[PDB]
Design a protein around this ligand. Structure first.
Ligand SMILES: [Mg+2]
Ligand SMILES: [Mg+2]
Ligand SMILES: [Mg+2]
Ligand SMILES: [Mg+2]
Ligand SMILES: [Mg+2]
Ligand SMILES: [Mg+2]
Ligand SMILES: [Mg+2]
Ligand SMILES: [Mg+2]
Ligand SMILES: [Mg+2]
Ligand SMILES: [Mg+2]
Ligand SMILES: [Mg+2]
Ligand SMILES: [Mg+2]
Ligand SMILES: [Mg+2]
Ligand SMILES: [Mg+2]
Ligand SMILES: [Mg+2]
Ligand SMILES: [Mg+2]
Ligand SMILES: [Mg+2]
Ligand SMILES: [Mg+2]
Ligand SMILES: [Mg+2]
Ligand SMILES: [Mg+2]
Ligand SMILES: [Mg+2]
Ligand SMILES: [Mg+2]
Ligand SMILES: [Mg+2]
Ligand SMILES: [Mg+2]
Ligand SMILES: [Mg+2]
Ligand SMILES: [Mg+2]
Ligand SMILES: [Zn+2]
Lengths: 98, 51, 86, 73, 165, 97
RNA sequence: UUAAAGGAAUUGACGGAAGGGCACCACCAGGAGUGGAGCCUGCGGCUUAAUUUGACUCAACACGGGAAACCUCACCCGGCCCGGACACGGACAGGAUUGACAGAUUGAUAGCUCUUUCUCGAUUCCGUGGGUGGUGGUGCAUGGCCGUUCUUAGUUGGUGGAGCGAUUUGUCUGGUUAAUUCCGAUAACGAACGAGACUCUGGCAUGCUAACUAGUUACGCGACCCCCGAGCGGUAACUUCUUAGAGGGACAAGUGGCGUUCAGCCACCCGAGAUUGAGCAAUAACAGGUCUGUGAUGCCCUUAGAUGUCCGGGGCUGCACGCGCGCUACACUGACUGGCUCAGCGUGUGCCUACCCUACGCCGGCAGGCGCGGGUAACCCGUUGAACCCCAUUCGUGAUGGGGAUCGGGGAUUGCAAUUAUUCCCCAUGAACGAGGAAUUCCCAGUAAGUGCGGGUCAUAAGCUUGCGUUGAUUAAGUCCCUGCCCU
RNA sequence: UUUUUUUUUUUUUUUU
C-alpha cells in the first residue's frame, strides 16, 4: 500500500523536476501499468495524487485514457512542502523568459 | 496477496478501447482500437469519409 | 414423432417397378433382332421400352456399337445418340 | 425489481489482527555490569537478517524481511 | 528499426490529431478555444493553437504555455523541444462555431438565461461575417418534461456534399 | 537513389511533384516521372447504432492513400537543398539512397 | 344531479367520399422461395442456485456487430484486498503500523483464521462527517447517436391584401414533370430549405500526364520439335492491355410528329454512354432503442460480512414445446473418379499497450510436425493456377450410390484448461425428407437465382454479416383491383 | 355483399 521512503521522495522529485506527470486509468488488478519514469505500477501513483488533488496542489487534466497534470501559482505557493527539501531553487519552467 | 490470476494474455481481456476503456463491443487492430460506439463519433476528427 | 404433414400432393409414378439386372437369351434375341431395327435408339429409350436396366442398357448397346453395327451421331457428357444405318 | 439484501448469519466479522503486544519488548541482558548477553539468536546474512532478530517458535525461527526460517529435525 | 506502413502511421497521426486537440480544450476551455495546427517539420512537431484570450495562453512570463508543451513530452514520446506551442488570436472573433458554442456555456452557468444568451451570440455571429447559423439547444429547461428549443439566423443548406466545409 | 511520395489529398500531391520539378529541372539533373502506384482503400463498416433497434443500416468509411514514386540519381548537396521546401501538412516525403 | 352541454367558422386527421397521381417495402405476367422435414442461431413457455438482461406490428426475433469453455459477467454458490481522498477529536502505542516460513486449515502455497513472535516506520489505526466506486434503478428526467413517421415532394419566414380572430393568399384553374420540375394565369411580390446542382462512382477515349515494385515490340542468348527467315515458354523506342491525375464529351445538340406562343413527350440518326449504382439530406414530432459505449450526467440505491473488487466452480448451451431468418436437401438438368481451363474489391509482425500472412523443402493416410526466405508490403505470399462450370467413366429412376443429424471407436492444432460446446481428420450408424397445407415475402437486366473467395470479432471459429465476382434467365414496362402514400 | 369492437389518472407558461 505504502511506497518505500525512496519512492515517495523521488516521485516528488520528478514532479518537481518536470512539473507534469503522466498516468493511465487501469487500477492494478488485471494488468500492472507502470510508467517509463517510475518503477512502481499505479496504486502508488494514484495514492500519490489523491493527496495532491485533495489539498489543491497539482491540477488534473484527463485525455481519453492517460492522465496529465498541471501546475498553477496557487500550486507553487502551496508547494512549500517540497520547496522545503532543497533551498530556493526553482526549475527552468516558471523561472524566466530569455 | 491475490490481486491477479487468470492470465488474460489473449482473448477478450486484452482488447481495450483507446477512448473510453471498455470491451463489450468488438475492438479492432487497425492502428486503432475502437468500440464502434465511439468510433463513429470520432472519425470526423481523424478523417474517415463515407463516400 | 407424428408426421402430421400439412401438405397434400400424391399420385406417385409406378410403385417402384422392377427392372432386369442382367439379360436373358429371351432378352438377347429381343436385343440382336430389333435393338438395331428401330429408327432411333437411346439407352434411355430401350431401358423403359423393354424393361431393362440402364447400366445393362449401355452394356448391351455399346456392344452392338462395338462391332460397328449401330450408327451413332455423336457422344458428349450426358447423351449418346444412336441410329440404324441401312 | 425489489432486491433488498441482508445477511443470513453464517459468518461474522472475524477480525483483522488486533496487534496485541507488551508494554515494550525487552531483549538484552547486563551481566558483570556491562557484558552483552544476546538471548534470541542471530541469523544467517542473506542481506536480510544481519541486524534482524529471530522470532521463537517450537522449532521454527523467523527472519523478519525475507523469511529465512532456521530449522532442523 | 522503427518502420510501420502508411496503413499505420497515417492512422497513428490520424488519432494524434484527436488525442492532441480534444485534450487541449480540457485544460484550455477558459477562453473561446478553437483548435490546432499540426504541420510537418521532420525534426520537430509544430503545434499552434487558436484561442480567444491569448494572455490566457501566454501566462505570467512564459509559464503556462511551455508547461503544456512538456505535458506532451511525457506520453507522446516527442521530446526535447520538438513539440512547440504558439498561439493565434481569432481576429474574426465571431466566425468559428466552436468558440461561439463555448462562451455560450459560461454565460449559462452564472445565470444569464438561455433566451438572453442564445440571441446574444446569434447577434454576435451574424454581425461577424457568417450567412448560416442555427443553434440547437434541447434540454431540461422550464420543467422535467424536456422541451426542445431552437434558434436560427441567416441561410442554412441541409443537403448535398458541401456541408463538410 | 529514389524518393517516395505518399499523401492524402491529391491536389497537394500533384503540386508537391510540381514543387519538386519546378525546383529540380533547372539544375543539372536526370529526373524520372510520377509513377502511379494504386491508391489503397482500407474500408471500415459500422453498425451505425449502439443498440439493436430499427433498420439495419451501415456506415461505410474509406481512407484513400495516394502514392507516386519519383527518382533522382545525383549528388546529395542538391538533395540537402531540396530538403529546404515548405510543405503541406498531410504530406510525408520519405527519402531513399 | 351536472361543469359543462351548445353555436358558427379554421387548422389536422379520418373517410367502404368525389377528380387527379405515385410505389414491386402493392399487384397483374413471372421467378426464386420460405411455410412440410432435418440442422443451426435468436425470442416466448418450462426448470434451476443462476438459466444475466435491453428490444415485443411494419418501426423486435442471425439485434446488441452477442461466433461467449475461464474472462467477457451485471446471475448464483464460496474466498482474498481497499480506492476511510480529506480533516476533526482519540489508544498516537513511553517508536511497539503491516507482512511472513511452517504446522493447522480449507477448491487453494488465503498468513482468511488460530498457534508461536521477527520485520516495519508516524502514510498510521479508532470514531464522526464526508467523498469515492457501482454492466444499480430509470431511456417515463437527460446529452449524443440511431432509425422511423418519410424515399416521398413537401416546408416555412418577411412585406402587402382578406378575416374581429383562429388562420389565410404566395403554396394556383390548367398543360407538364421522378418532383411546390417548369411554362402561363393570378392580391400578390420578392426570397429560402428540400428536389436538382455537388461528390465518390459505373461509364468512354487521347498517339496529355508515363512507370526496372506495370507493360510492350524486336534485338540478344539459350531450350524444344518438323526444321522453313517461321511456331509456345525461360536471361534500344513507346506507355496500346495494369495503374491514376489535370483537361474532353450527353445537351434532347439535327430531322420527323404530337404540342397555349409553350413546358414537354415520342421514334430514328451518329455517338462508348440519351441517364449507372449510390452517397449527404427538408421544417416538425414519437414520451420509438440505447444509463450494458463513454473520464456525458441529474436524482434515489449500495460502500469494509461490499449493488466496489479480483479469484475459484457453475449458469447464459437445460427441453412435452410454439414462432423467426437461414443452410444442405428432396435427384438424372443429376451422384461419383479424373482430365481441362480462366476472377474481381480486399488482407498480412517489435503499434499511445499486447501483438501475422506465407514462398520453397522434408516428414506424416488426413488434419498437422520441422528448418530456411520474403512481406511494416503494385517487389514477396500473388501472371492470388478461386469455384461454379466443362471433357470422359460408373450409376439408371432405386428413400438408391439421392440425403449426413444422431451415435461408436480413434488420430491432430490452438489454449490457463476444451468437461455438460471447441476446431480438423478418419472409419463406422446411414435418420426424416416423394417438390411442401390456408397464408405471405424478395425481385426488371449483368437484375434474379445457381457457384466460390476475402474482410469484421478470431487462439481455435462461419450457416450470420459485409463486399468481391462467375454461368448469367423468365415475364414485364402498366394499373389503382388488393396494401399504402401524395395534391385538390 | 360483410369490413362488428379495444378499459384509465394522465395537456404548466414570464421576459430585454
Ligand atoms: Mg428529447
Ligand atoms: Mg385533408
Ligand atoms: Mg403474382
Ligand atoms: Mg427458401
Ligand atoms: Mg421449416
Ligand atoms: Mg434473460
Ligand atoms: Mg429480425
Ligand atoms: Mg428502455
Ligand atoms: Mg425514449
Ligand atoms: Mg433520448
Ligand atoms: Mg377587415
Ligand atoms: Mg388556405
Ligand atoms: Mg496506360
Ligand atoms: Mg428534411
Ligand atoms: Mg419507449
Ligand atoms: Mg460509468
Ligand atoms: Mg450528480
Ligand atoms: Mg442470454
Ligand atoms: Mg418455426
Ligand atoms: Mg439415401
Ligand atoms: Mg455426405
Ligand atoms: Mg412472405
Ligand atoms: Mg480477415
Ligand atoms: Mg469475414
Ligand atoms: Mg452472429
Ligand atoms: Mg349490411
Ligand atoms: Zn473505451
Amino acid at each position: 500500500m505504502l511506497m518505500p521512503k525512496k519512492n515517495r521522495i523521488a516521485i516528488y522529485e520528478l514532479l518537481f523536476k518536470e512539473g507534469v506527470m503522466v498516468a493511465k486509468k487501469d487500477v492494478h488488478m488485471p494488468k500492472h501499468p507502470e510508467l517509463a519514469d517510475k518503477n512502481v505500477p499505479n496504486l502508488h501513483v494514484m495514492k500519490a495524487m489523491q493527496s495532491l488533488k485533495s489539498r489543491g496542489y497539482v491540477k488534473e487534466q484527463f485525455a481519453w485514457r492517460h492522465f496529465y497534470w498541471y501546475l498553477t501559482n496557487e500550486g507553487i505557493q502551496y508547494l512549500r512542502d517540497y520547496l522545503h527539501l532543497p533551498p530556493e531553487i526553482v526549475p527552468a519552467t516558471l523561472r524566466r523568459s530569455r | 496477496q491475490l490481486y491477479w490470476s487468470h492470465p488474460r494474455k489473449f482473448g477478450q481481456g486484452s482488447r481495450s478501447c483507446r477512448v473510453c476503456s471498455n470491451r463489450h463491443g468488438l475492438i479492432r487492430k487497425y492502428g486503432l482500437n475502437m468500440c464502434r460506439q465511439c468510433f463513429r463519433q470520432y472519425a470526423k476528427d481523424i478523417g474517415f469519409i463515407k463516400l | 414423432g407424428k408426421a402430421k404433414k400439412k401438405k397434400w400432393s400424391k399420385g406417385k409414378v409406378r410403385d417402384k417397378l422392377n427392372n432386369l439386372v442382367l439379360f436373358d437369351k429371351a432378352t438377347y434375341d429381343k436385343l440382336c433382332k430389333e435393338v438395331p431395327n428401330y429408327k432411333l435408339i437411346t439407352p434411355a429409350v430401350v431401358s423403359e421400352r423393354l424393361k431393362i436396366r440402364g447400366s445393362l442398357a449401355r452394356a448391351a448397346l455399346q456392344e452392338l456399337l462395338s462391332k460397328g453395327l449401330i450408327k451413332l451421331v455423336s457422344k458428349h457428357r450426358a447423351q449418346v445418340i444412336y441410329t440404324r444405318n441401312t | 425489481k425489489r432486491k433488498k439484501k441482508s445477511y443470513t448469519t453464517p459468518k461474522k466479522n472475524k477480525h483483522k489482527r488486533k496487534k496485541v503486544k507488551l508494554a515494550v519488548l525487552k531483549y538484552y541482558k547486563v551481566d558483570e555490569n556491562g557484558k552483552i548477553s544476546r538471548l534470541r539468536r542471530e541469523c544467517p546474512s542473506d542481506e536480510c537478517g544481519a541486524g534482524v532478530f529471530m522470532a521463537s517458535h517450537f522449532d521454527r525461527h523467523y527472519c523478519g524481511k525475507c523469511c529465512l526460517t532456521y530449522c532442523f529435525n | 528499426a522503427v518502420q510501420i506502413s502508411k496503413k499505420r502511421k497515417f492512422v497513428a497521426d490520424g488519432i494524434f490529431k484527436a488525442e492532441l486537440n480534444e485534450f487541449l480544450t480540457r485544460e484550455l476551455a477558459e477562453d473561446g478555444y478553437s483548435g490546432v495546427e499540426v504541420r510537418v517539420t521532420p525534426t520537430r512537431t509544430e503545434i499552434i493553437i487558436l484561442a480567444t484570450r491569448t494572455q490566457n495562453v501566454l501566462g505570467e512570463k512564459g509559464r503556462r504555455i511551455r508547461e503544456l508543451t512538456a505535458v506532451v513530452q511525457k506520453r507522446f514520446g516527442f521530446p526535447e523541444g520538438s513539440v512547440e506551442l504558439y498561439a493565434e488570436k481569432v481576429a474574426t472573433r465571431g466566425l468559428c462555431a466552436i468558440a461561439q458554442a463555448e462562451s455560450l456555456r459560461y454565460k449559462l452557468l452564472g445565470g444569464l438565461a438561455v433566451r438572453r444568451a442564445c440571441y446574444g451570440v446569434l447577434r454576435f455571429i451574424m454581425e461577424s461575417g457568417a450567412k448560416g447559423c442555427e443553434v440547437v439547444v434541447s434540454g431540461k429547461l422550464r420543467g422535467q418534461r424536456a422541451k426542445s428549443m431552437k434558434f436560427v439566423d441567416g441561410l442554412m443548406i441541409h443537403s448535398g456534399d458541401p456541408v463538410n466545409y | 537513389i529514389r524518393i517516395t511520395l505518399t499523401s492524402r489529398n491529391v491536389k497537394s500531391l500533384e503540386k508537391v511533384c510540381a514543387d519538386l520539378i519546378r525546383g529540380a529541372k533547372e539544375k543539372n539533373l536526370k529526373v524520372k516521372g510520377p509513377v502511379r502506384m494504386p491508391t489503397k482503400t482500407l474500408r471500415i463498416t459500422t453498425r451505425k447504432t449502439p443498440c439493436g433497434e430499427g433498420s439495419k443500416t451501415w456506415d461505410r468509411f474509406q481512407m484513400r492513400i495516394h502514392k507516386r514514386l519519383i527518382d533522382l540519381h545525383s549528388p546529395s548537396e542538391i538533395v540537402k537543398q531540396i530538403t529546404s521546401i515548405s510543405i503541406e501538412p498531410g504530406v510525408e516525403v520519405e527519402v531513399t539512397i
